[PDB]
């Protein structure tokens, strides 16, 4: 019946797990070290997670079958390879992308894959992006918000976005913990994570990208944001209203379009972790039905409630088909 | 015949203006110094603003009359008295509150008022809050997000919230620029201000308040957030979903209610700066029509579009009356 393609479905591979185990013992002050110790560290607070992330053919497929989920679009879980030094990140990105391709090929009717990269080295990341698109023929790209506590308005990353735009692959900008620029306010009450910091970190990255004019430089970029667009869809009117003040008094560059127009033209969103019919309806209304995709955020969230959320959405069947899988099949080139 | 009570309407008074002019010359590193120099500085980029903020019975009333706006609920404009040292802030809050009460008393069918205080000195602020409630008989309170780069989960401010709860006055937590904990990411593209920083700063403050259990300690507090609730209404499902992880792994304290239940019980929102029928409809649906109030954000925004936004809202007339003014009359003690 309804074709369900879940678009934010995390996976990991042993070489990355091993590298993160080692990294967990270092003095890295990144706020992601909370997650990294909890999942990849010695005496981990979340001991089952590595196994669940690594598994593709056991529990994961069983749960897909029990819930009638056609596909997972897999992505190397945050923080990807971004916490490592440039050489290590670059090496592990290739390894992880090869393993992603192999994972997809073992069950291509049930899995599609996003490749990743190490923007610590923008030139090498650009080469890897090209390899992912043309040599591995993967479905798209994923990166986890900031790299080296810089956001994607920084011209340092222009070679990355040039390659992404040229490749035609959509880039899913997944969260990671608040960067060092903002992490002081996220050290309490678990706010480092999905409950708050993930959304603030990722949305602020994207807003900087828009306001910096990144999408005039690279107008064919396609960006995807989970968690109902990291709430950016809610802020569209205010982003537009206040833009004049930003360019007049704040040194913001003049843009060809309004901020919300970049959001509708260059972005699409997914419903990961936001199983709200009201928020889904709002997003369809302001973005258009072509710009909203379904996701689970497995294994960090369970499949059944995410599935039931979309199966029961109070929207027409044709729009429901678009959200459940049609838009994803287009954006991520899935047949 | 629709009674329009605008709830986020900024004003200033000469003693505060004079103090901010002097403050503008100092080496303060607060991100609010951008606003303060633009408006109160010796060489202001926004030279008309002091006059427009100071004006109550001239341009402001003429514009209210031409647009059929019954009332402004006035508040001392951000950053209030919060940038000053404790003794200066305390004295100026007292003076500004006397001037607010006198302004209101001059035209009490057209103006209501929120008193303010200097949380730099919680014990003195507590006395002033009581005076605002019982002697000046003002309509509520206003404070501008952080004080001293601390948020309102900090036990330092417990005496303030104890007094606010006991007074029965609602506290409008208006924005100011991102605190030093987060300001590094808001130095570009005018993001210090309303376009992005204001919402991130204010929403993060409120989320810390909720997650810290402040509303179990003071369950009768009423908090009001502008800008369509600083987007917290959009995040309710995820805040609730992830709360288990926060209390299990993140050291968040155990709470009597769910995060969204505090938001609906203890908060109400206004539409200042978010003239979106879609966002208004979403907020009414998830918060209830009793929890949404209309505002303009004058003089930072013009009255006519804000008025026309609510007059044309695609909601029933009774709900429209609640949003336009009925809820404000209840929450802010207006006859
Ligand atoms: C590391 O990536 C994630 C982590 C969590 C979490 O920690 O609950 C949730 C969703 C995510 O995709
Ligand atoms: C009419 O202009 C806009 C409308 C909205 C909306 O209501 O969703 C958002 C941004 C805008 O610039
Ligand atoms: C200082 O308070 C505000 C400033 C602005 C601004 O700078 O455009 C807008 C709304 C506010 O209430
Ligand atoms: C002369 O010192 C102060 C005066 C006042 C006042 O006048 O309300 C308030 C606080 C002070 O520290
Ligand atoms: C059913 O539980 C919830 C629903 C919503 C919603 O859909 O607005 C938000 C928070 C919740 O916990
Ligand atoms: Mn995820
Ligand atoms: Mn009164
Ligand atoms: Mn305001």
XYZ file of C-alpha atoms and ligand atoms in Angstrom:
733
model
C 0.000 0.000 0.000
C 1.597 3.230 1.221
C 5.280 3.243 0.269
C 7.251 4.261 3.357
C 10.832 5.425 2.888
C 12.342 6.567 6.183
C 14.938 9.288 5.547
C 17.016 9.782 8.743
C 18.015 6.264 9.676
C 21.356 6.001 11.429
C 23.937 3.266 10.932
C 27.563 2.746 11.908
C 30.490 0.563 10.816
C 33.237 -1.104 12.839
C 36.114 1.129 11.687
C 34.210 4.213 12.841
C 33.104 2.574 16.104
C 36.728 1.651 16.856
C 37.904 5.179 16.082
C 35.255 6.673 18.360
C 36.128 4.234 21.159
C 39.674 5.614 21.000
C 38.431 9.193 20.696
C 36.266 8.785 23.813
C 39.441 8.508 25.883
C 40.897 11.820 24.666
C 40.657 15.291 26.245
C 38.455 16.668 23.451
C 36.216 19.391 24.872
C 33.579 19.171 22.108
C 30.067 18.895 23.552
C 29.659 15.755 21.422
C 31.920 13.971 23.887
C 28.847 13.477 26.072
C 27.217 11.326 23.360
C 30.561 9.783 22.446
C 31.248 8.563 25.996
C 27.636 7.412 26.490
C 27.640 5.208 23.387
C 31.262 4.559 22.391
C 33.113 4.955 25.669
C 34.347 2.560 28.308
C 31.523 1.573 30.688
C 28.953 3.250 28.398
C 25.635 4.497 29.786
C 23.937 3.393 26.559
C 25.554 -0.024 25.982
C 23.077 -1.415 23.422
C 23.396 1.443 20.959
C 26.497 0.387 18.988
C 24.891 -2.970 18.232
C 21.610 -1.400 17.187
C 23.367 1.177 15.002
C 25.537 -1.500 13.374
C 22.677 -3.875 12.698
C 21.020 -3.672 9.304
C 19.779 -7.229 8.615
C 18.510 -8.420 12.012
C 16.379 -6.306 14.361
C 16.239 -3.420 11.894
C 14.811 -5.432 9.010
C 12.496 -7.344 11.373
C 11.061 -4.075 12.660
C 10.708 -2.738 9.114
C 8.785 -5.873 8.162
C 6.553 -5.791 11.265
C 5.625 -2.165 10.571
C 5.378 -2.283 6.786
C 8.323 0.068 6.212
C 9.610 -0.335 2.645
C 13.011 1.348 3.033
C 15.552 3.018 5.239
C 17.758 5.716 3.759
C 20.872 5.059 5.847
C 23.375 7.644 7.076
C 26.524 7.314 9.169
C 25.340 8.408 12.590
C 26.393 11.742 14.103
C 29.063 12.908 14.711
C 30.130 11.057 11.558
C 33.854 11.460 10.921
C 33.891 15.136 11.852
C 35.528 14.884 15.300
C 38.750 13.377 13.996
C 41.789 15.177 12.634
C 41.770 15.808 8.866
C 43.843 12.792 7.824
C 41.830 10.393 9.998
C 38.494 11.880 8.983
C 39.369 11.716 5.290
C 40.519 8.085 5.544
C 37.487 6.942 7.547
C 35.022 8.764 5.295
C 36.239 6.682 2.326
C 36.015 3.482 4.381
C 32.547 4.353 5.688
C 31.298 5.289 2.230
C 32.554 2.020 0.744
C 30.854 0.122 3.555
C 27.644 2.110 3.018
C 27.653 1.180 -0.671
C 28.163 -2.474 0.207
C 25.413 -2.349 2.828
C 22.973 -0.898 0.314
C 23.950 -3.449 -2.342
C 23.218 -6.385 -0.057
C 19.547 -5.322 0.068
C 18.880 -2.525 -2.466
C 15.098 -2.948 -2.380
C 15.133 -2.146 1.358
C 18.083 0.235 1.806
C 19.397 3.376 0.163
C 22.461 5.273 1.387
C 23.878 8.735 2.016
C 27.635 9.165 1.773
C 29.529 11.434 4.135
C 32.795 13.370 4.129
C 35.375 15.130 6.276
C 35.062 18.892 5.705
C 38.125 19.385 7.968
C 39.880 19.155 4.586
C 37.580 20.864 2.066
C 39.627 19.912 -1.022
C 39.705 16.227 -0.089
C 36.051 16.297 0.935
C 35.209 17.687 -2.509
C 36.991 14.749 -4.125
C 35.147 12.297 -1.876
C 31.797 13.923 -2.679
C 32.495 13.394 -6.382
C 33.472 9.753 -5.720
C 30.268 9.172 -3.767
C 28.165 10.596 -6.594
C 29.796 9.007 -9.628
C 31.886 6.023 -8.520
C 29.760 4.646 -5.668
C 26.459 5.942 -7.062
C 25.031 6.617 -3.603
C 21.708 8.404 -3.108
C 22.858 11.622 -1.471
C 25.055 13.107 1.249
C 24.969 13.630 4.998
C 26.958 15.868 7.319
C 26.385 16.664 10.994
C 26.035 20.414 11.513
C 29.341 22.224 12.318
C 32.883 21.145 11.569
C 35.741 22.458 13.712
C 33.230 24.803 15.358
C 32.666 26.662 12.101
C 29.355 26.955 10.282
C 28.712 26.527 6.558
C 28.581 30.221 5.747
C 32.386 30.175 6.153
C 34.118 30.512 2.731
C 36.563 27.825 3.983
C 33.896 25.332 2.945
C 33.148 26.767 -0.506
C 34.942 23.877 -2.271
C 32.631 21.451 -0.465
C 29.477 23.220 -1.611
C 30.801 23.678 -5.131
C 31.242 19.894 -5.355
C 27.869 19.149 -3.764
C 26.092 21.501 -6.149
C 27.898 20.041 -9.166
C 27.123 16.466 -8.070
C 23.377 17.022 -7.925
C 23.237 15.144 -4.618
C 21.085 16.545 -1.834
C 22.882 17.186 1.456
C 21.132 16.159 4.672
C 22.465 18.422 7.418
C 21.877 16.249 10.466
C 22.403 17.613 13.977
C 25.332 17.239 16.298
C 25.802 18.870 19.705
C 26.115 22.678 19.940
C 29.509 23.911 18.737
C 32.022 25.645 20.994
C 30.530 28.973 19.907
C 27.338 28.176 21.835
C 27.876 25.074 23.966
C 28.169 26.805 27.359
C 24.370 27.170 27.584
C 23.780 23.487 26.787
C 25.739 21.742 29.548
C 22.714 21.221 31.822
C 19.579 19.048 31.927
C 20.681 16.965 28.932
C 20.317 19.978 26.651
C 23.413 18.934 24.679
C 21.247 16.450 22.842
C 18.018 16.038 20.842
C 15.867 17.674 23.526
C 17.188 21.165 22.669
C 20.784 21.714 21.600
C 20.560 19.630 18.413
C 17.843 21.900 17.055
C 19.532 25.160 18.044
C 22.896 24.104 16.611
C 21.513 22.876 13.297
C 18.985 25.633 12.693
C 21.573 28.319 13.479
C 23.963 26.715 10.967
C 21.275 26.803 8.269
C 20.220 30.371 9.025
C 23.843 31.510 8.700
C 24.029 29.681 5.368
C 20.945 31.509 4.081
C 21.809 34.981 5.364
C 25.405 34.770 4.126
C 24.141 34.388 0.559
C 25.429 30.842 0.134
C 22.415 30.050 -2.055
C 23.070 32.894 -4.463
C 26.582 31.503 -4.939
C 25.320 27.914 -5.260
C 21.679 28.250 -6.307
C 21.211 24.563 -7.217
C 22.114 23.224 -3.778
C 19.508 21.021 -2.147
C 19.641 20.862 1.631
C 17.525 18.590 3.848
C 16.816 19.280 7.540
C 15.233 16.785 9.915
C 13.156 17.433 13.034
C 10.530 19.301 11.056
C 13.127 21.592 9.501
C 14.735 22.329 12.874
C 11.802 24.752 13.357
C 12.970 27.073 10.587
C 9.547 26.680 8.899
C 7.984 28.277 11.992
C 10.228 31.358 11.793
C 9.835 32.174 8.075
C 7.733 35.332 8.442
C 10.085 36.868 11.026
C 13.208 35.932 9.059
C 11.750 37.787 6.105
C 10.435 40.740 8.090
C 13.695 41.459 9.888
C 15.958 40.954 6.881
C 15.865 44.658 5.966
C 17.264 45.600 9.363
C 19.933 42.935 8.935
C 21.132 44.327 5.589
C 20.692 47.986 6.558
C 22.241 48.002 10.042
C 23.780 44.562 10.537
C 26.175 44.155 7.612
C 24.194 41.270 6.135
C 24.785 40.963 2.393
C 22.065 41.851 -0.101
C 20.327 38.721 -1.376
C 18.462 38.034 -4.614
C 15.549 36.363 -2.768
C 13.901 36.637 0.640
C 15.177 34.270 3.354
C 11.975 32.168 3.225
C 12.298 31.919 -0.544
C 15.719 30.267 -0.198
C 14.161 27.965 2.345
C 11.385 26.858 -0.028
C 13.626 26.783 -3.119
C 16.755 25.143 -1.706
C 15.543 23.161 1.320
C 13.277 20.241 2.103
C 12.479 18.899 5.556
C 11.783 15.603 7.295
C 9.541 14.651 10.205
C 12.202 12.822 12.241
C 11.478 13.122 15.939
C 8.487 15.414 15.396
C 5.478 13.089 15.261
C 2.937 15.910 15.392
C 0.032 16.139 12.969
C -0.305 19.838 13.751
C 3.345 20.562 12.970
C 3.142 18.404 9.849
C 0.084 20.298 8.594
C 1.752 23.640 9.332
C 4.850 22.599 7.395
C 2.905 21.380 4.368
C 0.987 24.672 4.367
C 4.023 26.969 4.426
C 6.524 24.870 2.460
C 4.308 23.004 -0.002
C 3.640 19.241 0.045
C 6.685 18.490 -2.165
C 9.036 19.735 0.533
C 8.157 17.443 3.442
C 9.459 13.879 3.909
C 8.847 11.221 6.544
C 11.563 9.708 8.733
C 11.895 7.642 11.935
C 15.323 8.565 13.388
C 15.907 4.864 14.077
C 17.521 3.494 16.229
C 17.264 6.544 18.479
C 13.485 6.333 18.142
C 11.176 3.335 17.633
C 9.595 2.557 14.268
C 5.964 1.799 15.222
C 4.949 5.238 16.524
C 6.676 6.995 13.614
C 4.884 4.732 11.162
C 1.517 5.196 12.847
C 2.034 8.971 12.859
C 2.188 9.124 9.052
C -0.379 6.349 8.406
C -2.937 8.348 10.424
C -2.013 11.861 9.257
C -5.132 13.963 8.552
C -4.087 14.776 4.978
C -5.322 13.493 1.608
C -3.952 10.163 0.402
C -1.996 11.691 -2.474
C -0.211 14.190 -0.208
C 0.330 11.393 2.296
C 2.027 9.326 -0.443
C 4.323 12.272 -1.220
C 5.326 12.701 2.404
C 5.647 8.972 3.119
C 7.955 8.200 0.222
C 7.330 9.991 -3.068
C 9.305 13.108 -2.232
C 12.191 11.036 -0.885
C 12.268 8.901 -4.025
C 12.655 12.085 -6.080
C 15.105 13.961 -3.845
C 17.290 10.949 -3.109
C 16.961 9.281 -6.542
C 15.362 6.046 -5.363
C 13.463 3.960 -7.915
C -15.844 46.825 17.822
C -13.071 44.233 18.097
C -11.149 45.265 21.222
C -7.472 45.295 20.345
C -4.985 45.260 23.219
C -1.405 45.167 21.909
C 0.803 43.357 24.430
C 4.485 43.977 23.544
C 4.636 47.714 23.116
C 7.963 49.264 23.999
C 8.476 52.595 25.744
C 11.369 54.371 27.444
C 11.853 57.156 29.980
C 14.495 59.877 30.168
C 16.399 58.593 33.213
C 16.881 55.221 31.462
C 17.776 56.870 28.143
C 20.398 58.992 29.900
C 21.882 55.976 31.640
C 22.042 53.982 28.382
C 23.701 56.911 26.567
C 26.427 56.808 29.218
C 26.578 53.014 29.089
C 27.027 53.133 25.295
C 30.470 54.716 25.788
C 31.808 51.899 27.978
C 33.808 48.788 27.109
C 30.929 46.409 27.883
C 31.290 43.272 25.722
C 27.606 42.301 25.942
C 26.081 41.639 22.519
C 23.352 44.135 23.461
C 25.951 46.863 22.887
C 25.121 46.647 19.170
C 21.532 47.792 19.832
C 22.649 50.179 22.569
C 25.130 51.994 20.319
C 22.686 52.036 17.379
C 19.932 53.639 19.443
C 21.513 55.348 22.483
C 25.042 55.962 21.229
C 26.709 59.298 20.493
C 26.620 58.616 16.756
C 23.405 56.618 16.420
C 22.634 54.544 13.324
C 18.962 54.617 14.376
C 18.576 58.250 15.503
C 14.747 58.446 15.472
C 14.226 55.540 17.828
C 14.648 57.267 21.221
C 11.942 59.761 20.282
C 9.557 57.065 19.059
C 10.097 54.939 22.172
C 9.642 57.942 24.463
C 6.463 59.093 22.744
C 3.187 57.852 24.205
C 0.499 60.486 23.579
C 1.712 61.884 20.223
C 2.504 59.716 17.178
C 1.745 56.522 19.115
C -1.783 57.511 20.121
C -2.487 59.006 16.678
C -1.523 55.681 15.094
C -3.636 53.770 17.605
C -6.583 55.977 16.710
C -6.155 55.673 12.935
C -5.935 51.867 13.189
C -8.616 51.333 15.825
C -6.241 50.004 18.474
C -7.874 50.284 21.884
C -4.760 49.828 24.042
C -1.041 49.365 24.327
C 0.362 47.322 27.177
C 3.593 49.260 27.653
C 6.934 47.806 28.766
C 10.312 49.426 29.294
C 12.214 48.483 26.142
C 15.000 45.908 26.162
C 17.577 45.756 27.655
C 15.605 47.418 30.455
C 17.791 48.119 33.484
C 19.646 44.824 33.278
C 22.935 46.110 31.853
C 23.667 48.414 34.809
C 25.342 47.628 38.118
C 22.998 46.459 40.883
C 22.435 49.782 42.674
C 21.957 51.713 39.435
C 19.589 49.095 38.049
C 17.562 49.023 41.258
C 17.170 52.806 41.394
C 16.297 53.098 37.711
C 13.759 50.279 37.839
C 12.006 52.017 40.712
C 11.992 55.324 38.801
C 10.922 53.707 35.536
C 8.109 51.925 37.382
C 6.852 55.161 38.922
C 6.963 56.762 35.480
C 5.182 53.767 33.939
C 2.396 54.005 36.538
C 2.065 57.746 35.977
C 1.948 57.252 32.208
C -0.777 54.658 32.585
C -2.772 56.803 35.013
C -2.733 59.686 32.523
C -4.683 57.662 29.933
C -5.852 54.467 31.617
C -8.367 53.488 28.924
C -5.593 53.532 26.294
C -2.525 52.342 28.175
C -1.729 49.527 30.552
C 1.765 48.858 31.892
C 4.289 46.228 32.902
C 6.721 47.061 35.679
C 10.320 45.882 35.582
C 13.073 45.184 38.092
C 16.799 44.640 38.481
C 17.463 40.886 38.965
C 21.128 41.835 39.614
C 19.876 42.226 43.202
C 17.200 39.571 43.769
C 16.263 40.654 47.296
C 15.733 44.297 46.276
C 13.925 43.164 43.130
C 11.535 41.135 45.293
C 10.560 44.267 47.255
C 10.033 46.217 44.032
C 7.903 43.449 42.517
C 5.640 43.615 45.575
C 5.431 47.410 45.244
C 4.561 47.130 41.534
C 1.740 44.711 42.347
C 0.241 46.260 45.475
C 1.064 49.971 45.453
C 1.465 50.942 41.784
C -1.135 48.324 40.842
C 0.518 47.770 37.469
C -0.729 45.108 35.073
C 2.189 42.707 35.129
C 5.965 42.504 34.870
C 8.586 42.495 32.118
C 12.191 41.353 32.059
C 14.545 40.905 29.075
C 15.849 37.336 28.953
C 19.209 36.879 30.741
C 20.751 38.897 33.541
C 24.519 38.852 34.056
C 24.701 36.086 31.443
C 22.764 33.722 33.678
C 19.406 32.156 32.879
C 16.360 31.888 35.130
C 16.970 28.293 36.147
C 19.773 29.640 38.351
C 18.846 29.486 42.075
C 20.328 32.978 42.437
C 17.024 34.270 41.065
C 14.747 32.170 43.292
C 13.822 35.195 45.448
C 12.642 36.995 42.303
C 10.369 34.163 41.205
C 9.072 33.630 44.734
C 7.943 37.264 44.767
C 6.519 37.107 41.234
C 4.512 33.991 42.075
C 3.182 35.536 45.285
C 2.248 38.787 43.520
C 0.005 37.073 40.985
C 1.559 39.183 38.198
C 2.382 37.574 34.873
C 6.016 37.992 33.774
C 6.648 38.825 30.128
C 10.108 37.502 29.292
C 10.991 39.762 26.379
C 14.149 39.115 24.348
C 17.534 40.715 24.542
C 20.632 39.792 22.562
C 22.253 36.353 23.069
C 24.196 36.161 26.348
C 27.944 35.654 26.547
C 27.281 31.919 26.770
C 26.123 31.893 23.152
C 26.926 35.241 21.518
C 29.932 34.105 19.426
C 27.557 32.608 16.828
C 25.458 35.777 16.532
C 28.050 38.407 15.541
C 27.365 38.152 11.786
C 24.576 39.081 9.363
C 22.676 41.100 11.988
C 21.888 37.894 13.854
C 22.329 39.579 17.237
C 18.846 41.018 16.906
C 15.241 40.051 16.137
C 16.066 38.153 12.938
C 17.523 35.218 14.905
C 19.444 35.830 18.125
C 16.487 37.195 20.091
C 14.498 33.974 19.623
C 17.371 31.629 20.392
C 18.338 33.537 23.547
C 14.794 33.815 24.914
C 13.598 30.306 24.050
C 16.735 28.761 25.544
C 16.171 30.702 28.774
C 12.601 29.407 28.953
C 13.558 25.809 28.173
C 16.167 25.910 30.966
C 13.457 27.227 33.297
C 11.125 24.369 32.447
C 13.713 21.579 32.518
C 15.214 22.801 35.800
C 11.876 22.276 37.555
C 11.295 25.955 38.264
C 7.573 25.405 37.719
C 7.391 22.630 40.300
C 9.002 25.042 42.768
C 6.696 27.915 41.753
C 3.674 26.251 40.139
C 1.545 29.417 40.046
C 3.999 31.442 37.939
C 2.622 32.875 34.714
C 5.182 33.571 31.986
C 4.446 35.270 28.670
C 6.610 34.886 25.547
C 6.367 37.029 22.427
C 7.200 36.165 18.820
C 4.747 33.283 18.748
C 6.236 31.857 21.924
C 9.813 32.090 20.615
C 8.945 28.928 18.643
C 8.636 26.750 21.732
C 5.062 25.828 20.651
C 6.565 24.187 17.537
C 8.962 22.047 19.602
C 6.501 20.637 22.178
C 6.354 17.055 20.924
C 10.152 16.669 20.777
C 10.672 18.345 24.158
C 8.285 15.771 25.626
C 9.672 12.836 23.669
C 13.297 13.428 24.626
C 12.642 14.275 28.272
C 13.133 10.642 29.334
C 16.657 10.671 27.933
C 17.342 13.996 29.641
C 16.354 12.692 33.095
C 17.891 9.242 32.577
C 21.271 10.174 31.068
C 21.511 13.962 31.251
C 21.048 14.846 34.905
C 17.759 16.643 34.252
C 15.690 16.543 37.433
C 12.487 14.528 37.662
C 9.433 16.683 36.989
C 5.804 16.337 38.030
C 4.498 17.161 34.533
C 5.734 16.854 30.956
C 7.629 19.824 29.441
C 4.689 20.708 27.145
C 2.353 20.548 30.134
C 4.363 23.241 31.904
C 4.261 25.248 28.716
C 0.467 25.052 28.504
C -0.114 25.448 32.275
C 2.408 28.183 33.060
C 2.930 30.049 29.784
C 0.983 32.117 27.303
C 2.289 33.610 24.064
C 1.903 36.684 21.892
C 2.037 37.207 18.140
C 4.558 40.090 18.193
C 6.641 40.026 15.027
C 4.954 36.874 13.687
C 2.087 38.062 11.509
C 1.408 34.611 10.088
C -2.093 33.164 9.985
C -0.577 29.684 9.654
C 1.596 30.070 12.748
C -1.342 31.618 14.616
C -3.583 28.676 13.697
C -0.889 26.177 14.753
C -0.423 27.922 18.116
C -4.144 28.037 18.871
C -4.376 24.324 18.046
C -1.537 23.153 20.310
C -1.858 25.690 23.159
C -5.569 26.423 23.201
C -7.190 29.731 22.200
C -6.906 31.082 25.791
C -3.091 31.061 25.551
C -2.502 33.308 22.526
C -2.483 37.117 22.615
C -2.064 39.749 19.935
C 0.790 42.284 19.920
C 2.473 44.766 17.559
C 6.035 45.212 18.852
C 5.671 48.980 18.297
C 7.746 51.114 17.633
C 10.048 48.456 16.213
C 7.226 47.363 13.883
C 4.327 49.368 12.405
C 0.769 49.110 13.710
C -1.302 48.831 10.509
C -0.015 45.467 9.255
C -0.204 43.952 12.751
C -3.790 45.149 13.138
C -4.808 43.899 9.705
C -3.198 40.531 10.465
C -5.550 39.903 13.396
C -8.643 41.576 11.856
C -8.362 39.210 8.893
C -7.375 36.041 10.784
C -9.261 32.949 9.512
C -10.642 32.031 12.926
C -14.138 32.409 14.424
C -15.084 35.826 15.828
C -15.173 34.632 19.422
C -11.663 33.149 19.232
C -10.522 36.302 17.423
C -11.833 38.439 20.305
C -9.885 36.275 22.774
C -6.650 36.657 20.816
C -7.162 40.361 20.023
C -7.737 41.384 23.635
C -9.812 39.085 25.839
C -6.893 36.914 26.915
C -4.757 39.998 27.601
C -7.510 41.528 29.740
C -7.544 38.371 31.871
C -3.795 37.745 32.055
C -2.835 41.396 32.553
C -5.654 42.590 34.827
C -7.290 44.998 32.367
C -10.909 46.057 32.753
C 23.833 10.719 17.259
O 22.555 10.966 16.640
C 21.400 10.962 17.377
C 21.359 10.801 18.762
C 20.115 10.822 19.423
C 20.080 10.615 20.904
O 21.176 10.648 21.509
O 19.000 10.366 21.498
C 18.923 10.995 18.706
C 18.944 11.152 17.306
C 20.158 11.147 16.619
O 20.263 10.980 15.256
C 3.610 37.065 2.839
O 4.992 36.865 3.203
C 5.367 35.808 4.008
C 4.459 34.929 4.603
C 4.939 33.878 5.414
C 3.956 32.936 6.047
O 2.880 33.424 6.465
O 4.228 31.706 6.140
C 6.312 33.686 5.636
C 7.254 34.553 5.053
C 6.814 35.613 4.249
O 7.673 36.555 3.722
C 15.107 46.404 22.016
O 13.860 45.776 21.663
C 13.574 45.501 20.351
C 14.421 45.818 19.291
C 14.038 45.493 17.975
C 14.942 45.859 16.828
O 16.112 46.229 17.086
O 14.508 45.857 15.644
C 12.816 44.860 17.710
C 11.939 44.543 18.764
C 12.289 44.849 20.079
O 11.383 44.875 21.102
C 20.374 56.007 46.322
O 20.346 54.570 46.152
C 19.206 53.941 45.734
C 17.985 54.592 45.555
C 16.867 53.851 45.106
C 15.553 54.553 44.913
O 15.561 55.810 44.847
O 14.494 53.885 44.834
C 16.962 52.470 44.850
C 18.181 51.793 45.031
C 19.308 52.496 45.454
O 20.519 51.889 45.697
C 0.531 13.345 22.546
O 1.577 14.090 23.193
C 1.984 15.302 22.693
C 1.462 15.892 21.542
C 1.965 17.145 21.129
C 1.403 17.779 19.890
O 1.121 17.010 18.936
O 1.230 19.030 19.841
C 2.970 17.816 21.851
C 3.511 17.245 23.016
C 3.040 15.998 23.448
O 3.579 15.307 24.509
Mn 19.133 11.360 13.633
Mn -4.115 48.220 37.509
Mn 9.676 43.849 21.570
